[PDB]
From Swiss-Prot, chain B:
GO cellular component, as recorded: centriolar satellite; centriole; centrosome; chromatin; cytoplasm; cytosol; kinetochore; microtubule cytoskeleton
Name of the featured protein: Serine/threonine-protein kinase PLK1
Residues in cross-link Glycyl lysine isopeptide (Lys-Gly) (interchain with G-Cter in ubiquitin): 122
Subcellular location(s) per record: Nucleus; Chromosome, Centromere, Kinetochore; Cytoplasm, Cytoskeleton, Microtubule organizing center, Centrosome; Cytoplasm, Cytoskeleton, Spindle
Consequence recorded when altering residue 45 to A: Loss of centrosomal localization and of S-phase progression
Organism: Homo sapiens
Post-translational modification: Ubiquitinated by the anaphase promoting complex/cyclosome (APC/C) in anaphase and following DNA damage, leading to its degradation by the proteasome. Ubiquitination is mediated via its interaction with FZR1/CDH1. Ubiquitination and subsequent degradation prevents entry into mitosis and is essential to maintain an efficient G2 DNA damage checkpoint.
Domain POLO box stretches: 40-118, 140-222
Amino acid sequence: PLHST
Amino acid sequence: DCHLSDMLQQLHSVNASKPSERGLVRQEEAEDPACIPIFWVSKWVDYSDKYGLGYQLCDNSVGVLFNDSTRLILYNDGDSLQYIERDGTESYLTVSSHPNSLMKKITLLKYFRNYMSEHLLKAGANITPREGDELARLPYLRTWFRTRSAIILHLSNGSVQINFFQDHTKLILCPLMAAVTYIDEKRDFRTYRLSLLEEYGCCKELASRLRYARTMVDKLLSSR
């Protein structure tokens, strides 16, 4: 994933 | 360093006690609210293809670990900056004083802050951090890496945070308190003293995640 939720 | 070395031993001691193999597991007894973290990573954005890794700490300060190994941190007042150069030189300034050489980095940090603010959920939003010492420093991101299953974040105060991608569970390990905070899939946040988990045990979910955590701290220590 490229960023948090 | 010694923070990581301490954390590896604390983890190894828990894991060697086989805590999910107690006849009676009393996980609840290992809880200690006094140990809840002062700081954790509440949001992050990996733009390391181009700039670096930006993040928000639960106090709403934001920082960036840029591709060039420099670091910039904007305090929660939205003006105060801390800049750390490659050589370790540390400077305190304001966004509002006008440092020409840092304006591109400042606008990059403001971009991350603004992205995370518009789009991302705050991890541990429901939790009040514990009270931190009056003259203590704000931590920065020392190192990070990803595996196929988690992102691992190592803060300068010795904390290690591990976010599991698939089920949104998270650990926050502090070697100073020798404590772990577990955020489960339903966003329940619980903080345990590791030595008490040795005495009382824990569920197979937390146990399994602490074994993974030890493998991650080994990776941290191997990068040195």
